[PDB]
Design a protein around this ligand. Structure first.
Ligand SMILES: *[C@@H]1O[C@H](CO)[C@@H](O[C@@H]2O[C@H](CO)[C@@H](O[C@H]3O[C@H](CO)[C@@H](O)[C@H](O)[C@@H]3O)[C@H](O)[C@H]2NC(C)=O)[C@H](O)[C@H]1NC(C)=O
Ligand SMILES: *[C@@H]1O[C@H](CO)[C@@H](O[C@@H]2O[C@H](CO)[C@@H](O)[C@H](O)[C@H]2NC(C)=O)[C@H](O)[C@H]1NC(C)=O
Lengths: 210, 217, 318
């Protein structure tokens, strides 16, 4: 039988949030709780009646009541932004059931501007009759950027693919954009630039065939 | 030193077969219940099944969506858990984790996880990548790994000696359906030519291995 | 007092360092309650009866013990005593399991180092030696690498049932016999509970799990009940207060005797009202709904333990 969680919940930096899991198994049996950050394996944080694995600070705590189990996080930090799963056994004891997950957003994080890096078409790649502009964008928050590309100062709208921002180990974001050109248009212009706007402010960098 | 390592992940055709294994170390594997837990891209954790220790009957249990096509087994003599996957569907595309209860004893208290192995069920073909050098108070240099499928590509620097300043970015999924990623290591502009940096690219799905050297051009 | 408590009665969970440390005998009431908080009584039980080395309750203490069922009322008040607690205070004995003591289905036993349950005629505890823990069925102790430190978390301890134990008002034998008869009339098809004759039968089925309310009033076995009323009386006697020398821990026996008999110490509002007041030692109310008084079969008694828990029963065969 199933564990129901809310899909999403927010908390202000330093404040307390409580994530609840509901299911009939929880009347007899304890839940356990997992924190999963993107690109990482789940980490167990609470099990049984409020037991913490070693290395889990007591800011995470567990409770149960009736057919509900709850995970409570005091003094929320940016490092707590994660998906939180509850689990338990089913009625028979022959299976393990996970809740659907709750995405925890932590509000009030400090805004950071993006450090931008631009690489030109590698010379080995120019032996292969292809050219790709490699614009890396790192260390920004929040994780939402717009990218624009320039052939001298003209809007380059074909052959560009940007990633969705992803969270780094330092709880800031990273992204890339790639403009691909035939080595003609790389040399048909003296000036290329990748122009990155983050919260109304645009950082820019430029490379040249020189 | 207590750890679980999954392997066997890769690209498989729809309807195909694939065996995952999980290698355990640092503890008495025979005493452990071993579970598989998977996560399709962007979705929730889903328990696949488990095999109990012989002490508790060594029996198996499976989630309903994989019953009949998936079989779990263990070889205690080689410290290894297995997941035989048959009749694979595209929604079986997931990262697969093996896990156990090591210190938090109890059938569903998973405190020990492997890092997971990606299984891609798709009609597309594996493609190995083109690897290109990227040349420069501080200095920015790296490799750009172009046009591969599927994930992942592991990038190291100087066989793993150059461990700091390294920023391997997440890959872009091009409209072509192929992936590309760049890895950049910050070094001083300052031993530019005195020291060699070689980036080691590895694409296990295509058995590609490319060590490529950096210099200022 | 009456307010539900999420924490220890007096002492924060133990951070042991030496698995070979001695378990001192402490004479003071609050000293004993501090040990109860830290699960030092369950550790002592396991050393004596299972040749276990070290402790259970490392870092977590008594308020991180596991219960079956997980939905448990009396654990919400830290001051209500469990059977193991009452054992440490000398009010009852949690006995070592014999092979004939039936292990009830339902609890999740895998990995536990200790568990206990009330039985029809007492309280039984099951332990494991060093480096071992219970199998899924609870029947054996198998080798377990996770226990190597001998400083084990509270989750390795399982207490079965919703149970509160307290100083009782002893009753005459004739009162027990009348209670027993009313109990027999409410469960007339039951033959044996936990291997003890309850009703005379010729045929009987095999033992099956059996969830029941019960009270322990002394004498030869428990009184199981269906229709009964309970009421909680708040009491303020000396067992209702604990005494802490803040900085050091629980007050010593002689310091506690002085505060509770001579009115020369500090404490909360109720302790000053009943005992009198003036660093120093301070005494305050423990958290519980009070003492449980049970109405059953026309009588009213104050039992030693009351609760709802799982036993093994056999039914009559026609
Ligand atoms: C595990 O075994 C322990 C003994 O090996 C036992 O400790 C003993 O407990 C008794 C009863 O509480 C104490 O008895 C007497 O202690 C003082 C004398 O020093 C008297 O003033 C008291 O009235 C009491 O009669 C023993 O002192 C104590 N022995 C030691 C060495 O500490 C534990 O109680 C046993 N564990 C369990 C769970 O029963
Ligand atoms: C753990 O504690 C015990 C007892 O508190 C220590 O054993 C004592 O060791 C000293 C000298 O090392 C002896 O004088 C005592 O007679 C011993 N007592 C007992 C009961 O054995 C033990 O050394 C401690 N271990 C540590 C601190 O690592």
């Amino acid at each position: 039988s199933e564990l129901t969680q809310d899909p999403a919940v927010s908390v202000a930096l330093g404040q307390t949030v409580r994530i609840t899991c509901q299911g009939d198994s929880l009347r007899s049996y304890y839940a356990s709780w997992y924190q999963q950050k993107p690109g990482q394996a789940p980490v167990l944080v609470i099990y049984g009646k409020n037991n913490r694995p070693s290395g889990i600070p007591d800011r995470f705590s567990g409770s149960s009541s009736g057919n509900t189990a709850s995970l409570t996080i005091t003094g929320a930090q940016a490092e707590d932004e994660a998906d939180y799963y509850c689990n338990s056994r089913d009625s028979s004891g022959n299976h393990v059931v996970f809740g659907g997950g709750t995405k925890l957003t932590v509000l009030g994080q400090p805004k950071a501007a993006p450090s931008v890096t631009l690489f030109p078409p590698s010379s080995e790649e120019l032996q292969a009759n292809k050219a790709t502009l490699v614009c890396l964008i790192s260390d920004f928050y929040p994780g939402a950027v717009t990218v624009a590309w320039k052939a001298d100062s003209s809007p380059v709208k074909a052959g560009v693919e940007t990633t969705t921002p992803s969270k780094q180990s330092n709880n800031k974001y990273a992204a890339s954009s790639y403009l691909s050109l035939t080595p003609e248009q790389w040399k048909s212009h003296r000036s290329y630039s990748c122009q990155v706007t983050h919260e109304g402010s645009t950082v820019e960098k430029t490379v040249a065939p020189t | 030193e207590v750890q679980l390592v999954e392997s066997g992940g890769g690209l498989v055709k729809p309807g195909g077969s694939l065996r995952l294994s999980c290698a355990a170390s640092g503890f008495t594997f025979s005493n452990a219940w071993m579970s598989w837990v998977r996560q399709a891209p962007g979705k929730g954790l889903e328990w696949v099944g488990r095999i109990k220790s012989k002490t508790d009957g060594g029996t198996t249990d499976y989630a309903a969506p994989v019953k009949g096509r998936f079989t779990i087994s263990r070889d205690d003599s080689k410290n290894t858990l297995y997941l035989q996957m048959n009749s694979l569907k595209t929604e079986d595309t997931a990262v697969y984790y093996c896990t156990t209860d090591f210190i938090s004893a109890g059938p569903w208290y998973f405190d020990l996880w492997g890092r997971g192995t990606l299984v891609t069920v798709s009609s597309a073909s594996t493609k190995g990548p083109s690897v290109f050098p990227l040349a420069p108070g501080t200095a920015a240099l790296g490799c750009l790994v172009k046009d591969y499928f599927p994930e992942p590509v592991t990038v190291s620097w100087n066989s793993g000696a150059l461990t700091s300043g390294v920023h391997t970015f997440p890959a872009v999924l091009q409209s072509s359906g192929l992936y590309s990623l760049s890895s950049v290591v910050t070094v001083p502009s300052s031993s530019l030519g005195t020291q060699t940096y070689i980036c080691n690219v590895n694409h296990k799905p295509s058995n590609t291995k490319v060590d490529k050297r950096v210099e200022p051009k | 007092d009456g307010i539900q408590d999420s924490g220890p009665i007096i002492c924060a969970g133990p951070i042991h360092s030496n698995k070979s440390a001695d378990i001192p005998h402490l004479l003071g009431y609050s000293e004993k309650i501090c040990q109860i908080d830290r699960l030092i009584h369950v550790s002592s039980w396991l050393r004596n009866h299972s040749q276990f080395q070290g402790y259970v309750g490392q870092r977590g203490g008594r308020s991180q013990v596991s219960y079956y069922p997980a939905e448990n009322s009396y654990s919400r008040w830290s001051g209500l005593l469990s059977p193991c607690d009452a054992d440490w205070l000398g009010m009852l004995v949690v006995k070592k399991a014999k092979g004939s003591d039936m292990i009830v289905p339902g609890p999740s036993y895998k990995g536990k180092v200790f568990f206990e349950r009330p039985t029809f005629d007492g309280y039984v505890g099951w332990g494991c030696g060093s480096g071992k823990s219970r199998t899924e069925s609870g029947e054996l102790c198998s080798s377990d690498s996770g226990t190597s430190s001998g400083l084990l978390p509270s989750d390795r301890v399982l207490w079965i049932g919703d149970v509160a134990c307290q100083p009782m008002t002893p009753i005459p034998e004739e009162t027990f016999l009348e209670l027993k008869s009313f109990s027999q009339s409410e469960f007339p098809d039951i033959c044996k509970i936990d291997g003890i004759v309850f009703n005379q039968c010729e045929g009987e089925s095999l033992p099956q799990p059996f969830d029941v309310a019960w009270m322990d009033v002394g004498h030869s076995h428990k009184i199981i009940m269906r229709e009964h009323k309970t009421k909680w009386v708040q009491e303020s006697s000396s067992k209702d207060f604990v005494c802490y020398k803040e900085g050091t821990g629980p007050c010593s026996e002689s310091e506690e005797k002085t505060c509770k008999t001579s009115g020369s110490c500090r404490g909360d509002m109720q302790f000053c009202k009943v005992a009198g007041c003036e660093a120093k030692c301070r005494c305050s109310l423990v958290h519980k709904p009070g003492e449980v008084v049970v109405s059953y079969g026309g009588m009213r008694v104050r039992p030693k333990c009351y609760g709802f828990s799982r036993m093994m029963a056999t039914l009559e065969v026609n």
